Design a protein around this ligand. Structure first.
Ligand SMILES: N[C@@H](Cn1oc(=O)[nH]c1=O)C(=O)O
Ligand SMILES: N[C@@H](Cn1oc(=O)[nH]c1=O)C(=O)O
Lengths: 410, 597, 410, 597
C-alpha cells in the first residue's frame, strides 16, 4: 500500500460521527480526504490515511538536527506521502520535494471577538469630542465675559448683570432652564440671542449623536496590524510549537517580525502551543488576553463554525503555499505533480473549496450583524454623571464652608 | 369488503369526541371520512376503515429500499384503497396508482403569528433601567436637601429656599420647566448648576435610547418568503420525519431549496418532527424561533383554530394535488377516478369544502383585523403616563381636602423635633450597619445543566447554598471579581465603611443637641456641624452603593465561569441600604429646620 | 422538419443581439429554446423554432368558434408542436393534449412600485396616533380643570391661578416654556409636578418616533389582495386580450373574481392588452393607475430585470400549470411525455430554472433596500405647521377684533 | 544582441522625463529597467530594449487561439526575453518558459479612498432645507409684529410689549428659553400659544432629522473584502482588457468569484479598461462608484503618489509571482533562473525594492494618520455655530459703542413717520406686483441627452428658451401641474391676487393718514384699520408663497415627462416676493408706532 500521513486538523481531516465504528479510509472526512482520494484515482495507488504518530506538523531541533512530525517520517521512510496542510519552506525544500500550490493562504491573526466592554466612567460625554467640550467652556466663559463689558457700559440705575450674574445667565441659557433676569439692552440681547442659538444646536447635536451610538454599535478591534502587536504587550500572542509559522519568525529579517520573535521566547508563561485546536481554546478562554497567529484558511473555517467567537484582524502577514509533500526522489513525484496540475485545470480544487468552507458556513457574518438587540441603558452607562453630581455636591459643601467663615472674619 | 386506510390528521380524518362510545365507521370523522361514504355511494362497495400502524405517510428509504407507512400498505397489499391526505408525486406514481387530483395545494410556511402588542403599563420606563430610575429619585432628594443646607447656612435676609420650596426647585430643574426662584449665593449656584448638567444628560439619554428602540422596532424584517428564510439562521426549519415535503426538499435542485436542505441536513438537534400535531406544538412553544413547513390546506385550518396564533407567510413554494390512491393494477381504480370526476362534476367536493372550513372556523377574519399597520405609538405605549397623570390628579384632589381640613383645624415642640431627629438617626445607624453586616444584597439562582442553586451575595462573602440540605458555602467576593474592576470595589467598601463612621459622628453629635445634654449655649453650631456631617454621610454612602451595583453587574456578565446566575435581582438590605440613605437626610432636614428657627 | 411554435416572450423566448444575423434555431434564446433543444435530443426530431404568425397565446371567439394564436395553429395543422408558455385549461384540453406540468405558477398582481408619496398636510403629527392626540387635549383641559378647583379652595389673598391662567400654565408646561406663575400649594404643586412628567415622556416620545420614520422608511402597498382590487376602483387593472388568464375570469365561479370580470368589460378606456410586453409599459407609464395581472413566473423575471420598477403584491390567485402543447393524436405525444418525465427525473428542469431567473437577477432585492439615502426635510414635510401657524394667526386677529369691541360695548 | 521586451507600466517600466532627449537604454527607467542591467551584469549579454506594439500583456483568445501582446512576442519569437510585470500562470507556463518568481504579489482591490471630511461652514444647516430656514425667519418677523399689533389695540394701562420687546419675546419663545414678560390679553395668549406649538414641532424636527443623518452615517458599511463587494451592485468592477487578472476570474470556480464574473460578463457599458493608467483614472472620477481590481504591488505604488486618494481594501484574493520569461526551449533561460536566484542570494532584489518604493514615496504614512476612528462630532461639524457665535459677539460689541455714542449724542417727526410708512408701502406695492407680473421666479436648466435648455417659470407661464437663438417658448403653468396638487395651486394664485388687492386697501388708507389728507379728527381709527389690513395683507400673502414652492417642488419631481430640470433654484422676484412681505410689516410697525403715541 501507500501510507499517507495527514495531521488531524479540521476541516482538512475530520473524524466520522461513528469514528470508532469505521476503519481506515472511511473513518476520515475533510478536504485532504477528498484530495487523497482525487489524487489516487488519477494515479492508481492504494492510499492508507494515517495520523502522524508524533502528532506534529514538522520541525527540526537546530542542535541535534532531527526532524519530527510528518517531515521526519517522510525522510526516514516510515510514511510514503503527505497530502496534508504542510507549508513549502526553504528548509523543507532541501529534504523533500513539493507539488505546486493547490491552495494559496497567508498567516493571519485570530483574536477573541471583542464584545461590548464596560463603558467608561466618563462615557456619557462621548457624542461630543474633547476638542468641542474644551471650546464650549472657553466659549461659555468667553460669551459671559462679553455680557459684563456690555452691562457696565450702558446703565439703562444698578447693573444686575455683574460678572457674578453673567456666568449664571449664560449657564441657565446653556442648561435649558432660563433665568428670571433678562437683558434690557440691544447690545445685551444680541449676546443673549446668539448664545441661545448656540445651545439649541449643541443640545440637539448631543441628543442626536447619542441616538447614533445606541442604535448602531461598532465593536472596535483593539489590534488590527502587525504594528499593533509589537508596540503593546497588553495582549499575549503566539503560534504552534512545531510549525512552519514558528519557523518563519525564527528566520525573519523584517525588524517588526524580529521584535515579535524576541518577545515570543523571552516572556513566558507557556505561549507556544502543541495543537491548533489547543490554540483555539487558548483564545476563547483567555478573555481578550491571547491572539493566536495561524493561517487564513485555518481561520476562515473557525469564523464560519460554532459558536463563532473569533474574528480575523488585519490580513495576511505574507504569502505562503500548500503542497503535497513527496519524499526526495520518489516514484509518485511526477504523476502526483501532473495530478496537481490536472485537477487544478478542471477547477476541481476550486469546486472543492467553494463547497467545504461554505456549506458548513452556517454562521454566515449576517447572523451576528442583523441580530440587533433592544437594550435599556444600564447604570454603567451614566454612572459618571452621578459621580460628578456628588462631586459637585461636596464642592458646594466646601464653598458653603468657606464663604460663611469669611463673612465671620470680615 | 374494501379496506380503506388513512391517518388521523385533522381536519381531514379526525377521531370522534367519544372514541370508545361509537363503533366502526362511527369511530372517525372529518373531511375524508365524509368523502369515503360518497365514494361508496357512487361505486357501491362496503368500505372498512383502518389506520396505519406506524403513524406516518412514509416513503422508501435508502438502505432498505422499501416503502413504509401508508404507501407501504398500498405497494404491498395490506390495504385495498387509501382515501387520505396523500400527495401525488412521481416517486409515488411509479409504485402505485392515483386518481385525478381533487384538492389543489402547495407547500406553505407556518411561523408563529407575531404576538399581540402588549406593552405593559410601564412601557415608558423601557429605555432606562429601573436601577437608574431609583438613583434619579434618591439623587433628587439628595440635591434639594443639600440646597436646603446651603441656603440656611450662607448669608448671601429672608430665605425663599425652604424644604418644601427646595424640592420644588429641583423638580422644576429636572423636568426642564425651570423655576422663578433663583439661587443667588455662589454655593447655591454650584449645587444648581451641577444638577442642571445632570438632567441634561439623563433626558437626552432617555430620548436617544427611546429612538434607539423604535428604529430597531422598524428594522425587524418580518420575514415573509422562503428566500428571506434561507438567508437567516435565527429560526429553524423542520418538516415531518417522512413525507412528501421532506422528499421534495431532498430531490430539489433550486439554489434556495438546496441551501435549506443543507441546513436541514446538519440538524443539531434533529429539526424533523414525528407528526404534524407535535410539529405545530414546537411552533407554539418556541415563540417564533421555529418554523414548520407544511401543506397549505393544513395551514389554513390550523390558522382558524384557537389560540389562532400561527400565521401563514408568503405563498406556496410548489403546486401539488391530493389523490385517492389504489395499488398498482387494481381494477377498482378506474371507477375511483370516475367517482372523483363525478363529485367534481356535481361540485360536491366544493360543497364538502366550504361546509367544513367555514363552519368549524373558530376565530377567523385575519385579513379584517390586520388592515391596520402600526407605525406610531398606540395609547397603550404611553398609557402608564396617563395613569400616573389621572392618578396624580386624584391624589392631589385628596391633598386639597385635607389641607383645607388642616386649615379649618388650625382655625379650631423643639424638643420633639430633636427627638424625631435622633430617632430617625438611630434607625439610620440600624439600617446602614444591617446592610454592611448582611450578605443578602443580591438574591439570584445559578444552575448546572437541571439543578439550580439559590444563593445570596454581598460585598464580603458570596454564600452559595449547597443542595442536599442547607449548604451555605461562602466564598470571598472581593478577590472573586476581575481585577481591573476590583479597584473600584476596593473603593466602595472603603466608602461604605466611611459612610458608617461618618454617620457615627452624626447621631452622636445629635446626642449633644438634646436639652438634658451638654449646653444650650453654643450648641447651635454643634447642631450645625452635626447637620453638615449627616449630609456628608449619605452622599458618600450613596456613591458606595453606586460603585457596588456597577461593579456587581460587570461580575454577572464578565466573571469567573463555572457559575453564572440567571437573576441578578437586588435582595433585601440593599433596599435598607437606600432606606438608610433616605433616613440620613430625613433626619437632617429636621435639624436644619430646628437650626433656622 | 418539426415546426415548433413559441410566442415571443422573455425570458422564455429571447432575441439574439445580432438577431438579424443568425437564422432559425440560433437566433432565439431563453428557456423554451433550452427546453425545445432538450426535448429534441431525447426524442430525435428536427425542430424549427417559429414565432406564431398571429402573435397570440390562443383563445376562441365564443360565437364563431374559431381559435387563434398558437392554439388554432396546432388544431388546423400549421404548427407541429408547441413548447411555449401555454396554460393547461379545460377548453384547451378538449382540442389538444398536454404534457405534465414542467413548471408550477400562479396568477399574480404587478403594480408600479409605490415610491414615497408627497406627505400629507398634517403628516407632522404622524408619530403619535389620533387616539393619543385627542386624549392629550382631553387630558390638557382635564388637568387644567383640576388646578382651578385646587386654586379656589386654598387661598394661601388673590388666586392668580384662575381658569384663564390655568390653561395657560398647563400650556406652558406642555410647550416646554415654563411660565413665571407657580403654585404655592402642595395640592397645587402635585398637579404641576405630575403634568410635567406627562410632557417629558410625550415630547421625548414624539422626538424619538419621528426619528424612527425618517431613518427606516416603509413604502406601503396601497393594494395587496384580490379583495383590495374589487372594493376600490381607484386603480385600473387588466389582463391580456387573448390569454388563459382572461379565459379564467370569464368562467370564474367565485364572486370576487366575478366582480372583477364585470368591471373589466364594463368601464373601458382600453383595459386589455395585446402583449405582456405591452402590459409592462402600461404599468410603468400609468403612475400607479394600472396593475397588470399576469403569471408569477412572468413576474419574477420583471422584478429581477432593469430598471426593477415593479413588485409583486399579495400572491397567487390560483394554481396553474405549464405544459408542452401537443396536437390531438400526435406521434410525439408519448415520447415527449416520457421526455417531460425523464428531464424532470434528473432535475434538469430545476437546474435550468435556478440558472435563468437568478444569473440575470442583477437587481437582487438587496440593491433597493440597502441603498438608503441621506435626505433633508423638504418643505412638504412640515408644510401644515406653517398653515396652522397662520391659521392660528388669523384666529388671533379675530379675537383681538371682538374683545376690543365688547369692552367698547360694556 | 538580446532583444528585451516590456510594457510601460509605472513603477516598473517608466518613460524618462525627456523621452526625445535621451537615446536607447536611456529612454526608459523604473524598477525593471534597473533589473535588466543587473541581469546583463551576471550573464554578460548586450540587451536591446523594446515595447510591445499593442500596449497590453495579452492572452490567447477564443476564436483565433493565438497569443497577443507581450506573450505573443514570446510564443512566436519576435522578442528574445521579457523582463516585465508578467504573472506566472499555468496557461502561460505551457506556452513559454518562466524563471523563479522574484516578486510575490496578489490581486488586490482599489477603490477610491474615502474622501476627507469637509463638512463646510454651514453643516449644522443640513437637516432642514434652506427654504425652511427662510420661512422660519419670515414667520419670526410675522408673529412679533402681530403681537405688537395685538398689544397696542387691546385694553386688557402700560404696555410692556414694544416692537423691540416683542421681537425679544418671539426669540425667547423660539429658542425655548422663554421670557419673563407674559401675554395677559387673551388675544395675546392666542398668538403666543400658536408660536409655541410652531417651535416645538420645528426643533423636534431638527433633532430628529439630525439623528436621522448620523444613524445612516454609521450604517455606511465601508466595504473591505470582495465578499461584501460581491453582495453590492452600487459599485462596478473592472480589470484590464486582457491580462492575468481577467483570466483569473474567468477560469475561477469559487462561488464568490463566479458571481462577480457573471456581473463582469453582463457589463453595460464594458467595465474592462484598456490600460492601468486609464483604469485608475476612472476611479479618480467616478468618486467611489467604481472599483478597479489590480495587482497589489501596483496598488501600493499608486497609493503613495498624489493625490493619494486611492486606498487598498481587504487583503489579496490570490497569491502569484512575477517571472522573467523566455520563449519555449531557449538556451538562455536557465542562466536567467540562475541570475534570478543570484540576486535573491545577494538580496539585491530587496535592495531594489526598499530603494524604489520608499524614496519615491510622495505622501506616505497612511496607517499613521488613520489611527483615529471618527465617531463623534468634530469641531468642524458645528464650526459655523461658533463662527456665528464669535461673530455675533463682535457685532454686538459694535452695537455697544454706537449706542453709547447715540446716548452721548443724545446728551449733546410724526409727519416723517407717516412719510416713511407710505414710502415703504409704495415699495411693497411695487415689490408685490412685480412678482405677480414677472415669470422669473424659478431659474433652472433642463436637458436632452448633450443639449441643455435654460428656462424660467412662474405661476402663469413656463417660458422655455428655445436654442438656436432667443427662443422664449411660453407654456401655461396652471394646467401643467398634476391635477390633485393643482387645487392648492389654484388657491395660491387666488391668495396672491388677494395679497395684492388687500395691499391696495393698505397704502390707499395710508394716503388718508397724511396731514394734508382727509382729517385729523377720526383719522386714528382710519390709521387703525389700515394697520390691520397691512398685517392681513402679508400673512395671506406669505401663505400664497408657501403654497407655491410646495406645489412647485411636487412638479419638479412628479410632473409631465419630456422635461425635468436639474436645478429648481429660486430666481429673482421670488426674493422680491419676500421683500414685499418684509416691507409690508416694516411699514406696519411704523403706523402702529404712530398710533400708540
Ligand atoms: N501548519 C503549518 C504551521 N502551523 O499551522 C498552524 O495552524 N499553526 C502553525 O504554526 C505547517 O505546516 O507547519
Ligand atoms: N400566457 C397565458 C395568458 N397570459 O399570459 C400573460 O403574461 N398574460 C396572460 O393573460 C396563456 O398561455 O394563455
Amino acid at each position: 500500500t501507500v501510507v499517507v500521513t495527514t495531521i488531524l486538523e479540521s476541516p482538512y481531516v475530520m473524524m466520522k460521527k461513528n469514528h470508532e465504528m469505521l476503519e481506515g479510509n472511511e473513518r476520515y472526512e475533510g478536504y485532504c480526504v477528498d484530495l487523497a482520494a482525487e489524487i489516487a484515482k488519477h494515479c492508481g495507488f492504494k492510499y492508507k490515511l494515517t495520523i502522524v504518530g508524533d502528532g506534529k506538523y514538522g520541525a527540526r531541533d537546530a542542535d541535534t538536527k532531527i526532524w519530527n512530525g510528518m517531515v521526519g517520517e517522510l525522510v526516514y521512510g516510515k510514511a510514503d506521502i503527505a497530502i496534508a496542510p504542510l507549508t513549502i519552506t526553504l528548509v523543507r525544500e532541501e529534504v523533500i520535494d513539493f507539488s505546486k500550490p493547490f491552495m494559496s493562504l497567508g498567516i493571519s491573526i485570530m483574536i477573541k471577538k471583542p464584545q461590548k466592554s464596560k463603558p467608561g466612567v466618563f462615557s456619557f460625554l462621548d457624542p461630543l469630542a474633547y476638542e468641542i467640550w474644551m471650546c464650549i467652556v472657553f466659549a461659555y466663559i468667553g460669551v459671559s465675559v462679553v455680557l459684563f463689558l456690555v452691562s457696565r457700559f450702558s446703565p439703562y440705575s444698578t447693573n444686575e448683570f455683574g460678572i457674578f450674574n453673567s456666568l449664571w445667565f449664560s449657564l441657565g441659557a446653556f442648561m435649558q432652564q432660563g433665568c428670571d433676569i433678562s437683558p434690557r439692552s440691544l447690545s445685551g440681547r444680541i449676546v443673549g440671542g446668539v448664545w441661545w442659538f448656540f445651545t439649541l444646536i449643541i443640545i440637539s447635536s448631543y441628543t442626536a449623536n447619542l441616538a447614533a451610538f445606541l442604535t448602531v454599535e461598532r465593536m472596535v478591534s483593539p489590534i488590527e496590524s502587525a504594528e499593533d502587536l509589537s508596540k503593546q504587550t497588553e495582549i499575549a500572542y503566539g503560534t504552534l510549537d512545531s510549525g512552519s509559522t514558528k519557523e518563519f519568525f525564527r528566520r525573519s529579517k523584517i525588524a517588526v517580525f524580529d521584535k515579535m520573535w524576541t518577545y515570543m521566547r523571552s516572556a513566558e508563561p507557556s505561549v507556544f502551543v502543541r495543537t491548533t485546536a489547543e490554540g483555539v481554546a487558548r483564545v476563547r478562554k483567555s478573555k481578550g488576553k491571547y491572539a493566536y497567529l495561524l493561517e487564513s484558511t485555518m481561520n476562515e473555517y473557525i469564523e464560519q463554525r460554532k459558536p463563532c467567537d473569533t474574528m480575523k484582524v488585519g490580513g495576511n502577514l505574507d504569502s505562503k503555499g500548500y503542497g503535497i509533500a513527496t519524499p526526495k526522489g520518489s516514484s509518485l513525484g511526477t504523476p502526483v505533480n501532473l495530478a496537481v496540475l490536472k485537477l487544478s485545470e478542471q477547477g476541481v480544487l476550486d469546486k472543492l473549496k467553494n463547497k467545504w468552507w461554505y456549506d458548513k458556513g452556517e454562521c454566515g457574518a449576517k447572523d451576528s450583524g442583523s441580530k440587533e438587540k433592544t437594550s435599556a441603558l444600564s447604570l454603567s452607562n451614566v454612572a459618571g454623571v452621578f459621580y460628578i453630581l456628588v462631586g459637585g455636591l461636596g464642592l458646594a459643601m466646601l464653598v458653603a464652608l468657606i464663604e460663611f467663615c469669611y463673612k465671620s472674619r470680615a
